[model samples]
Target chain A: MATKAVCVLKGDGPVQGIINFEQKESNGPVKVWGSIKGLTEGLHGFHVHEFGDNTAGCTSAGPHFNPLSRKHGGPKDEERHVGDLGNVTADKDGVADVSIEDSVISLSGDHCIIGRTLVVHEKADDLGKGGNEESTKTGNAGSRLACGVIGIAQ
Target chain B: MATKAVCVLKGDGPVQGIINFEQKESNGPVKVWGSIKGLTEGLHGFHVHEFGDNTAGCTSAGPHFNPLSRKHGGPKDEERHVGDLGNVTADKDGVADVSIEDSVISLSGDHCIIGRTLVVHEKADDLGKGGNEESTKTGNAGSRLACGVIGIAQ
Candidate 1:
């Protein structure tokens, strides 16, 4: 059975859009899709941060969802956190649409990405390309500009 | 006729609080109450905005719900938009509790606030106290930190 998860980002302001995740098989790379807007244009750092608890704000979402205790890497790297899905870009019109598939991220299993918090950052993640203090951990992705928790979709 | 509307405010960060409006009498003011936390400790500008469409972030909520073509002012002003509910103050602990019995704001009236937008600002609203450009129309309250559309509630 195919399972879907969606996050409706909001709290501190008006953020337009939805992040969608879908998986067809029981064990497969989950497909990701986002149709969100309302932020500065250009490349934005996107990742599934730790925790599903959103009591405070994106600030309370905690660090990256690195359950494996691995270093931050690109979406192509299996060594990165299970939550590391990489960047999502929005156009000048403030519209965002990005899609991806992976072997590491999942919808069900020990590596299930459901019930987790996802965030769209104000800055680019650099995908660890930047050799700096944050390059290894967060890619120095700035503050979260939009966020939501993954839940079953309609 | 009576209706109850509620919205849970959230964004890319922590979830702030809830906005609730319950229908009082046929022509009485709608009772607004809520406890919003998780922000910098201080007073923040609050208002009922135009649209119920939060698809484009708070920016899409359009301007303050001004069906009367009135100037921006406090909740009690006669020449103000029915949507201008005024400021919602936060305590030292960054908590906000608002309870208002407004005359113009009603549950079932020509100036109903239901299906509109509610927003908490990042800065204090001068309430037109400071004479500035667009002050009488917007109060220069700054960006939205928390926002949601009013809808039916149980």
Candidate 2:
């Protein structure tokens, strides 16, 4: 497959970034890339949700896109939610470099690319086991802060 | 429809902001409440894409999710891309207040949320007809510096 995807920023805020994806030749493992500027440092929960409506501001994106009905765990964990791609950490400079792998999601197919949304949470994803009273699916990563939709080029 | 969306900013970055959408009584529109801090005093392009893959950095998040097969135009333009929600301008102190309509996107169904990504560009989107080569479609903005997936708490 051809490794080429581009995203454009459509809002105005202090947080900003760009995302890129390509199917790796070695394993056909989809390779993802992003460069973010002007973000609050520390830890943030990053994952794909089931909706693209920012109508509710960023919160309208909805929960993680866990179609297999699995528990929320890290990507490397054997028994974990499909949305559990793990967490993306930011250095003291507030810049983040993220990457991961998964067999559940595809660049194209039945569960292919169509109606998904990317969300940046305010806190860390405690792997859905963090004792936060509420659900532990990635540690109540706070609000839906920043969001965007994934689209294919025509 | 219950607007139960909230966002928060937790970091030491020079700029930070948070927004939350509360479903109003009459559904006049989604109510957005948020604040921005530490911006550089200018306009920025903010938008929702269609994926949440942060594997290869944020690049794997793909492009803006515009399923209408529309051109990259301004937000107000009916013929523009569905992802084109328009620009966000910052004040002298680098702060902004966000508010908009809900019809900008759907919350469920085939046109619902799924594969999408959100991006923040270094420059502003010139409303798509900026008088350039790629201007008719992308507004000529360069470099995707920061990004994240749009997720919600169920």
Candidate 3:
């Protein structure tokens, strides 16, 4: 048996997508796959946010979901925010077929991502190496383009 | 020893609030408490919707969370939707200090409410007593004013 979760992403604009996540075992990495459209034909920052409240739009989704209060980095960094999913690249047709195996994310435990917000940014994530003021705090992922709350799925 | 959850409601208009839910024991009722402002000075509809996805605002929140597929009714009715929370009243100052102990809502299990959407409507819920078409389905509750995703809390 596996634990599955999902997020239905949306933006004030034409951005939209349905993302699925699955964990086959207690210690297994979460399998992430989805299709996103209406992008800029390049990399876009993707991350889990701290709050599920998007009442004021994506601005209210808050910063990255850094439960351990750590600095931001790439998803594979030795020390990175839990929500640092890095980036997803869109094709020439402005579509992205998201595929990844994330070891740090989970469907259960203290760092469980269910019921949190997943945001797609308007710009690429610098992976904490941007050598700028906001680099280590948010990977310099510009403004949020679209976002959705992660939830339990069948 | 106990489980808790929360939702931060918001609207395009002057509506905002924070709600907290707690369960002392596995089989005990869920204790709901919160404060909402910027409401009309009367009863307002409150409920849990089927989905946590609010991408297109409250309209995309889907129908009431009726996992059992039962007809809509009041919180105390013999036959009712699982998300039937009835109503909350606002005072002359347009504020409601909500407090409720619900036997039907849970924080764990199949009916676990985390990762779902809680909604506040524009009008009062008739408790299915309205002699109209939308009565049996939604208690004649008007448009959604504000909504937020229920998320796990410390």
**Interface Cα RMSD in Å, per prediction:** 10.7, 8.0, 3.5
Q: What are the per-residue Cα lDDT tens digits for candidate 3 across A1-154?
A: 2287778887899888988888988687998889899998999999999776655677877888888888899889968888899999999998989998898988877677888788999999999998887999888878888887787665
lDDT, model 3, position A89: 94
Q: Residue A66 in candidate 2 has what lDDT? A: 67
Candidate 2: tens digits of C-alpha lDDT, residues A18-44: 656565442356665676555578777
Model 1 misplacement above 4 A: B1-154
Best candidate per TM-score, number? 3
Q: Give the runs in model 3 whose Cα sits over 4 Å from its true position.
A: A1-45, A49-84, A89-112, A119-148, A151-154
Q: True contacts preserved, each candidate?
A: 0.00, 0.19, 0.38
lDDT of 1 by residue, A36-150 (tens): 7776678778888765545466776678887789988889876687778788878898767878787777765556555456788878887787888788789878888877655
Error of 3 at B65 (Å): 0.7
Assess the local accuracy of residue B18 in candidate 2 as a C-alpha lDDT between 0 and 100.
58
* Model 1 agreement with the true structure over B1-154: per-residue lDDT tens digits: 3355565565555537876777757666678888888867777888887654455666666788777787788776776778777788788888888776677766445575544567888888777666887778777788888776554343
Tens digits of lDDT, candidate 3, B1-154:
2287778887788888988898989788999989999999999899998876655677766888888888889999978888999999989999989998888878876677888789998999999999886987889889999987787565
**Per-prediction CA RMSD (Å):** 13.6, 9.7, 4.8
Candidates' C-alpha lDDT: 0.71, 0.56, 0.84
